[PDB]
């Protein structure tokens, strides 16, 4: 609840560190899918190095 | 690279907008800009989760935020000509939802 930029900014900096996917409305396990995709991407990137 | 995270995106957007453009007019323009920033952060940070989210990797960027700010500014100026705290109901909610 604010009427000026400063209140909203202080609310922004007060946000908790833990940004679960539930923030966006996505299920919290979408991070698991993202990590699996990035792991497979790392596998492929290493593989192309021959 | 831009730092991942909703908070970083909102801070960057807030620092982008000059305070003169966010504090003038009715005192509700600030909260309108905050809602715009939150919406932009949501639709730009969901972009990372391309499969589960924005099916295709769309290009929502700075120009879109500037255009949305211009729209909000013009329609709030036209709806509320003065400088009093315009009531929440009189806010052109339908105009902002439809244009965006």
Swiss-Prot record, chain B:
Q: What top-level branch of life does the organism fall under?
A: Eukaryota
Report the locations given in the UniProt record: Cytoplasm, Cytoskeleton
Query: At which residues is Phosphoserine found?
Result: 15
* Membrane spanning stretches: none
Task: Tell me its family.
Answer: Belongs to the dynein heavy chain family.
SUBUNIT field:
Homodimer. The cytoplasmic dynein 1 complex consists of two catalytic heavy chains (HCs) and a number of non-catalytic subunits presented by intermediate chains (ICs), light intermediate chains (LICs) and light chains (LCs); the composition seems to vary in respect to the IC, LIC and LC composition. The heavy chain homodimer serves as a scaffold for the probable homodimeric assembly of the respective non-catalytic subunits. The ICs and LICs bind directly to the HC dimer and dynein LCs assemble on the IC dimer. Interacts with DYNC1LI1; DYNC1LI1 and DYNC1LI2 bind mutually exclusive to DYNC1H1.
Kindly identify the disorder that the protein's record connects it with: Charcot-Marie-Tooth disease, axonal, type 2O: An axonal form of Charcot-Marie-Tooth disease, a disorder of the peripheral nervous system, characterized by progressive weakness and atrophy, initially of the peroneal muscles and later of the distal muscles of the arms. Charcot-Marie-Tooth disease is classified in two main groups on the basis of electrophysiologic properties and histopathology: primary peripheral demyelinating neuropathies (designated CMT1 when they are dominantly inherited) and primary peripheral axonal neuropathies (CMT2). Cortical dysplasia, complex, with other brain malformations 13: An autosomal dominant disorder characterized by global developmental delay with impaired intellectual development. Some patients show signs of peripheral neuropathy, such as abnormal gait and hyporeflexia. CDCBM13 is associated with variable neuronal migration defects resulting in cortical malformations.
This molecule's function is given as: Cytoplasmic dynein 1 acts as a motor for the intracellular retrograde motility of vesicles and organelles along microtubules. Dynein has ATPase activity; the force-producing power stroke is thought to occur on release of ADP. Plays a role in mitotic spindle assembly and metaphase plate congression.
Description of its domains? Dynein heavy chains probably consist of an N-terminal stem (which binds cargo and interacts with other dynein components), and the head or motor domain. The motor contains six tandemly-linked AAA domains in the head, which form a ring. A stalk-like structure (formed by two of the coiled coil domains) protrudes between AAA 4 and AAA 5 and terminates in a microtubule-binding site. A seventh domain may also contribute to this ring; it is not clear whether the N-terminus or the C-terminus forms this extra domain.
What is the name of this protein?
Answer: Cytoplasmic dynein 1 heavy chain 1
Query: In the UniProt record, what gene is named as encoding this protein?
Result: DYNC1H1
């Amino acid at each position: 609840d604010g009427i000026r930029r400063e209140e909203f900014v202080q609310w922004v900096e007060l946000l908790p560190d833990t940004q679960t996917p539930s923030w966006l409305g996505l299920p919290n396990n979408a991070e698991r899918v993202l990590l699996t995709t990035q792991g497979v991407d790392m596998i492929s990137k290493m593989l192309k190095m021959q | 690279e831009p730092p991942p995270g909703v908070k970083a995106n909102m801070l960057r957007t807030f620092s982008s907008i000059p305070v003169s453009r966010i504090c003038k007019s009715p005192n509700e323009r600030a909260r309108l800009y905050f809602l715009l920033a939150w919406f932009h952060a949501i639709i730009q940070e969901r972009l990372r989760y391309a499969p589960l989210g924005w099916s295709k990797k769309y290009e929502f960027g700075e120009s879109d935020l500037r255009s949305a700010c211009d729209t909000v500014d013009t329609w709030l100026d036209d709806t509320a000509k003065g400088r009093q705290n315009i009531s929440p109901d009189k806010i052109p909610w339908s105009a902002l939802k439809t244009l965006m």
